[PDB]
């Protein structure tokens, strides 16, 4: 091929292959082409420079010249043809103003959020309301004592993180004023973060999942209660020696690379960060602890009125209206300060402002208590995905697969036992019974869809295996309903 189309480099035509993609960038000086990953740039930089300005040119050309902030109220702030368009949520201009008027949104009712003093108090109130089977309101815990939730010692901060994880460790970072996501080196984030005076752009990452880092995963953990109801945890138990061998002996082993990795996240944001309204993926519940700084959550109850508002807001092309202004006073304000812990069940629609440089440890989880709401949110996601194109990474990893395995490995067992024994399940296993009915109904839909128009890409679960699971499920459910026409 032509030599002007050779990196770079790398001195190759094709880059072996985070991912370079088949992506390139040309020097506006030496005019040669580089693979993106041979350019020296990090993904968050790909759109920043009008001029670039490779390594072989900088000591004599100067550092790359970045676009002029021509329109700070647009996501494309660098674009002149957008100077005249409206103010977008939450661009630099929008946030700037919002920081001053934001305090007018109402506090929540006691029916929506329950603020307790510590983990012990939480437990009481929690049980009062039916525990996790009947978990519908968010809780804010002013002190973590009594939650049995491992957290590092304060004074612990961003530095220890980039040291434990490594400085080259890349993480999906939100370019705030641009309301987009790009990979950034932990070390590169630390630099920008530590420069408190010069922040031409703001960054906030929420997606540093460390469950797989032998050090980190030991330093910050979910509350005991979260672990006890986590469906992911139940399917991929942290087990060893004979327990693990047994797990293998029963065909109950699942690969670690199939595990939804979402229960252990570190988050860090620059002052001024705003994350726009969303529901957490898969309708997952959240634990969220402030190690440093402060967050302001703007929240709305998982009602059908609110969902319908949210779905329309999410599918409309409008970009200039805060969802709070169309929500008919559904949005409430809750401030979370250093050392305080938020616990959000399935459904809650929320946005968050970061008043102050921050560091947080949190995680997402699925539990049977919120099965129905979890499926409701899944329907909400899928309906939005029909109108708007998004990346699967912003959705719950292996949602369906998880449910396929939970039925096969957990539920399918219990039902069969009762069917062999007595045994009407509504006696000490009612919760289990209803969970099954719900799970199967949704699963029959997936099976239906899969059958009406084909399976996804290659893997993971073959159609015939889903059916064989289903065949088994229908039988035992069919069989159990009978038992429920005597007892």
């Amino acid at each position: 091929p032509k030599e002007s189309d050779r990196c770079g480099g790398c001195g190759k035509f094709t880059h072996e292959d985070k991912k370079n993609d088949f992506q390139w960038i040309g020097c506006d000086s030496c005019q040669t082409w580089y693979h993106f990953l041979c350019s020296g740039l990090e993904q968050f930089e790909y759109y920043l420079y009008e001029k670039f300005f490779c390594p072989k040119c900088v000591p004599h050309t100067g550092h790359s010249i970045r676009y002029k902030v021509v329109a700070p109220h647009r996501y494309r702030w660098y674009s002149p043809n957008e100077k005249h368009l409206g103010i977008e949520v939450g661009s630099k201009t929008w946030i700037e103003d919002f920081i001053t008027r934001e305090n007018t949104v109402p506090s929540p009712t006691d029916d929506e959020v329950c603020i307790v003093e510590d983990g012990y108090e939480f437990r009481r109130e929690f049980e009062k309301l039916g525990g996790a089977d009947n978990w519908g309101k968010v809780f804010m815990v002013k002190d973590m004592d009594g939650l049995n939730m491992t957290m590092p010692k304060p004074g612990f901060d961003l530095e220890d993180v980039v040291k434990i994880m490594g400085s080259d460790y890349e993480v999906d970072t939100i370019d705030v004023y641009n309301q987009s996501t790009y990979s950034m080196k932990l070390d590169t984030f630390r630099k920008l973060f530590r420069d408190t005076k010069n922040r031409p752009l703001l960054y906030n990452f929420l997606s540093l999942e460390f469950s797989d880092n032998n050090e980190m995963k030991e330093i910050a953990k979910p509350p005991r209660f979260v672990q006890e109801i986590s469906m992911v945890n139940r399917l991929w138990p942290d087990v060893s020696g004979a327990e693990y061998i047994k797990l293998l002996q029963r065909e109950e082993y699942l690969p670690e690379d199939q595990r939804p990795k979402v229960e252990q996240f570190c988050l860090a944001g620059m002052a001024g960060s705003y994350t726009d309204f969303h529901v957490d993926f898969g309708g997952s519940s959240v634990y969220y602890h402030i190690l440093k700084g402060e967050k302001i959550f703007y929240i709305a109850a998982p009602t059908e009125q609110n969902f319908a508002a949210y779905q329309a807001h999410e599918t409309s092309p409008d970009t200039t209206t805060w969802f709070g202004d169309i929500a008919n006073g559904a949005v409430k304000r809750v401030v979370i300060k250093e050392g305080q812990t938020l616990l959000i069940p399935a459904g809650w629609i929320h946005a968050v402002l970061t008043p102050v440089d921050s560091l947080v440890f949190g995680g997402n989880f699925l539990h049977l208590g919120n099965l129905e709401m979890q499926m409701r949110v899944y329907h909400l996601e899928n309906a939005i995905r029909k109108e708007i194109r998004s990346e699967e990474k912003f959705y719950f990893p292996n949602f369906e697969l998880l449910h396929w395995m939970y039925m096969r490995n957990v539920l399918l067992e219990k039902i069969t036992e009762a069917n062999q024994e007595g045994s009407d399940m509504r006696e000490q296993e009612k919760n289990i019974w209803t969970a099954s009915q719900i799970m199967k109904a949704e699963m029959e839909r997936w099976m239906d869809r899969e059958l009406r128009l084909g399976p996804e890409k290659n893997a993971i679960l073959p159609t015939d295996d889903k059916n064989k699971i289903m065949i088994s499920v229908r039988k035992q459910i069919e069989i159990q309903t009978k038992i429920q026409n005597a007892k």
């Binding site: 999906d172 996501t181 957490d280 912003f394 292996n398």
Partner: peptide, 10 residues
């Protein structure tokens, strides 16, 4: 746009 918790599968 695309500014939300991100968690590849995997």
């Amino acid at each position: 746009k695309a500014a939300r918790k991100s968690a590849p599968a995997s």
